[PDB]
């Protein structure tokens, strides 16, 4: 009798039990041990290398494992693969669709990812023997805007689309090996853990659901946010991750706690976050807000270590190298400022 | 070596920059356009009547040597708080509104709310909207047949009359023109409620005449860039 209402009541009581279990292990918080570590100070990073090669606004970027070649996406249909060490554009990939929202550099540097409102993840070969770049694989199985994607390897990647479901693709075959379904809102970003075994994806339902790339199911669901989680990044330790949403507050969730540990909020900044990345140590939380400035939040004291000047438009993409050497923040002014 | 791979990378960057400067000309030439609606609001008839043109994702047309990039969104999902932000550098947001579906759900109020969210947006606030009051061929008789009345979903119709600057169609009942201009002014109310001066609505009436519809888009985008440059030079 009344399967809908009864199942909704069981879901409500399960959520209440989960919240009670979270609060039971929440005797303290991340700010309760704030007196054990020294602060970091206002470290105002400067633009070491500027990248001005795009024609339209830059929506996505991604770093490589070599920490030298970075990729960036813009609505002009160009996927510029920059060289951060010498300020050189290695490739200018002519994209099939103009509007693109994702970027994913392969861990080996041979592949790269694309995609946007076309609902198609365009994989391009970089180290191919054919000279210029070309479409290495056409992942077309999503019904929503392909928001973000991450490169696990040259064989299989996972893309966060706008159809409320993510999917672990396969560059060898071209089909979704497993679909990550369960997000109530359209997914906006995903990030791979350093162990590459499990990933978390932040959607527009204030719930960054943690998935398992192996089993294809949702491990945990982190409902600590308030607005559309536009950005996400897994802590370099592999057991935690930060989230940037539209509520102007960043939150650092932990997989082993299933709840938020620190909420990076500030009354001076009311605009939402669409860029979140961690340094080599994870102490600095690079957070690209919508106020044309990226806030370097301290992941242990909940205080920005200095906003970033330069960009005059919304910074929708920001990423730190695999060794934390430099962070390249690209905004909607077709520019990429690499901070250090 | 010392200058072997570095010079190769520099010349590759130079070739890429040359290609990018060549593509910037056509990028500034192809004024991107956003074609959307409140759901089956007659946008398919607009894609059909646009240069006679991977399904409904993007169509391109060129008039007076001015090419355009009309990106249709007839294949995305209903939630539009993220993909609509990708149209921040877009030139014109062609809003195809079903002007006769006010009774059918109240699709007219849905289109009004969509236009309000597009206008007061944080990124779409600097972009005008080519309001295409589609389905006028049905509105020609929708108000007389009584099957779809404005007062059933808009009480301001009784307090509204045809404006003095109205341009009625030859052979139209005054009630039809009154309802059409009421929808136009109801859109323009929330259009001008922003008070920023960076974007203004371009209300047109389509689906009534089967002539070149992209000519209206051309004449609208012309004035769009006109007013954009005027605001840039503080002339308007």
């Amino acid at each position: 009798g009344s399967e809908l209402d009864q199942l909704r009541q069981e879901a409500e009581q399960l959520k209440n039990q989960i919240r009670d279990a979270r609060k039971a292990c929440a005797d303290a918080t991340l700010s309760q041990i704030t007196n054990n570590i020294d602060p970091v100070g206002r470290i105002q990073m400067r633009t070491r290398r500027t990248l001005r090669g795009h024609l339209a606004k830059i929506y996505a970027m991604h770093w490589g494992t070599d920490s030298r070649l970075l990729v960036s996406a813009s609505q002009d249909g160009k996927l510029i693969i920059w060289d951060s060490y010498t300020t050189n554009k290695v490739h200018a990939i002519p994209l099939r669709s103009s509007w693109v929202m994702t970027c994913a550099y392969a861990p080996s540097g041979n592949y790269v990812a694309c995609g946007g409102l076309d609902n198609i993840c365009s994989i391009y070969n970089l180290k191919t023997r054919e000279g210029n770049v070309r479409v290495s694989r056409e992942l077309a199985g999503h019904t929503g805007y392909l928001s973000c994607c991450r490169f696990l390897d040259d064989n299989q990647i996972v893309t966060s689309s706008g159809d409320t479901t993510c999917a672990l693709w396969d560059i060898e075959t071209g089909q979704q090996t497993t679909t990550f379904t369960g997000h109530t809102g359209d997914v906006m970003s995903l990030s791979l853990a350093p162990d590459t075994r499990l990933f978390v994806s932040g959607a527009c339902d204030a719930s960054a659901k943690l998935w398992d790339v192996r089993e294809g199911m949702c491990r945990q669901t982190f409902t600590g946010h308030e607005s559309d989680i536009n950005a996400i990044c897994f802590f370099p330790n592999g057991n935690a991750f930060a989230t940037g949403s539209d509520d102007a507050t960043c939150r650092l969730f932990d997989l082993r706690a299933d709840q938020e540990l620190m909420t990076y909020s500030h009354d001076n900044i009311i605009c939402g976050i669409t860029s979140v990345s961690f340094s080599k140590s994870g102490r600095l939380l690079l957070a690209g807000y919508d106020d044309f400035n990226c806030n370097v939040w301290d992941a242990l004291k909940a205080d920005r270590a200095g906003v970033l000047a330069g960009h005059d438009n919304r910074v929708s993409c920001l990423g730190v190298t695999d060794d934390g050497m430099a962070v390249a923040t690209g905004s909607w002014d077709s520019f990429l400022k690499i901070w250090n | 070596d010392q200058r072997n791979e570095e010079k190769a990378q520099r010349e590759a960057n130079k070739k890429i920059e040359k290609q990018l400067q060549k593509d910037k000309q056509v990028y500034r030439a192809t004024h991107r356009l956003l074609l959307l609606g409140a759901g089956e609001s007659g946008k398919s008839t607009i894609v059909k009547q646009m240069r006679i043109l991977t399904g409904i994702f993007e169509t391109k047309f060129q008039v007076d040597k001015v090419n355009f990039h009309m990106f249709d969104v007839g294949a995305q999902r209903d939630e539009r708080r993220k993909w609509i932000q990708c149209f921040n550098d877009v030139t014109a947001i062609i809003f195809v509104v079903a002007s006769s579906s006010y009774n059918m759900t109240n699709r007219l109020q849905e289109a009004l709310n969509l236009f309000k969210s597009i206008w007061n947006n944080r990124w779409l606030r600097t972009i005008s909207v080519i309001l295409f009051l589609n389905k006028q061929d049905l509105l020609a008789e929708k108000v007389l047949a009584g099957k779809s009345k404005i007062e059933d979903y808009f009480p301001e119709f009784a307090r509204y009359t045809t404006p003095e600057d109205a341009t009625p169609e030859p052979g139209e009942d005054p009630r039809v023109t009154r309802a059409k201009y009421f929808i136009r002014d109801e859109f323009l109310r929330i259009s001008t409620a922003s008070g920023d001066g960076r974007h203004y609505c371009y209300p047109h009436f389509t689906c009534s005449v089967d002539t070149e519809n992209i000519r209206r888009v051309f004449n609208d985008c012309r004035d769009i860039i006109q007013r954009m440059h005027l605001r840039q030079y503080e002339l308007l």
Partner: nanobody
Amino acid sequence: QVQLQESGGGLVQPGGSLRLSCAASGFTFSNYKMNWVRQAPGKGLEWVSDISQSGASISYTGSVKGRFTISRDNAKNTLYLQMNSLKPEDTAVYYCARCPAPFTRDCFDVTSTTYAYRGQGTQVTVSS
């Protein structure tokens, strides 16, 4: 968790009065442009009312303009929809769809089902 529980509603007489108490917990209620949407049996989700972050930009749809009355309570973190002079077309499940982006006058919460920051749904019905 962004949860919205709409108390009240039920089955009343057409033309009477009704008040919905939407419990807005899990977010800063005084910073989101909370609004009201309904879903009639067989009809899609249509926007009903709206109120600003502080209560200035108050707007309703044409079907409830003048009849309904919205009032946000930033102290109690709840959204009220005072329904007056109901109509037979008010047979719908009223949802508490919230503006996702705070400090903004824009949101697309008039979307179809499976919306994130929407109420759980109260069955507001009228007799005949």
